[PDB]
């Protein structure tokens, strides 16, 4: 991340719904669970079947990454759910509402100041 100057201003934070976990943009709740189940409990999947190129790619990548993993399956499923299912919460925001910005909301937007911050990594085109 990159830090810019801190500007003292009269911050007016409005309460609205913002993204906590962006999840996967091409998968819905159901799609996420379908991949989760298939990756963590391939035998207990049930009648559900993967029906999307995105689901197949994610399942293949996670299975390749989770080879010989002795971690407790419940933790793996919980972490996958965190990474995939979209989660939103009402927060008093003044700047960007993206997850990359909401997570550092405490550091960037204050009651009488704003910290110019540019989170690392790539940003979603949308």
């Amino acid at each position: 991340g990159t830090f810019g100057p801190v500007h003292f201003r009269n911050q007016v934070k409005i309460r609205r719904r913002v993204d906590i976990n962006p999840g996967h943009a091409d998968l819905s709740a159901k799609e996420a669970q379908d991949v989760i189940m298939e990756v963590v409990f391939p035998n207990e999947v049930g009648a559900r079947i993967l029906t999307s190129e995105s689901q197949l790619t994610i399942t293949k990548e996670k299975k390749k990454e989770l080879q010989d993993c002795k971690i407790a399956p419940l933790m793996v499923a919980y972490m996958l759910e965190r990474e995939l299912v979209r989660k939103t919460r009402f927060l008093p925001v003044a700047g960007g509402t993206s997850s990359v910005y909401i997570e550092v909301l405490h550091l960037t937007q204050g009651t009488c100041w704003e910290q110019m911050y540019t989170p690392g990594g790539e940003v979603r085109n949308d």
């Binding site: 189940m37 963590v40 409990f41 207990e44 399956p73 419940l74």
Partner: peptide, 8 residues
């Protein structure tokens, strides 16, 4: 016996 007993 059923590993998904806790998740679902």
């Amino acid at each position: 016996f059923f590993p998904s007993s806790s998740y679902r």
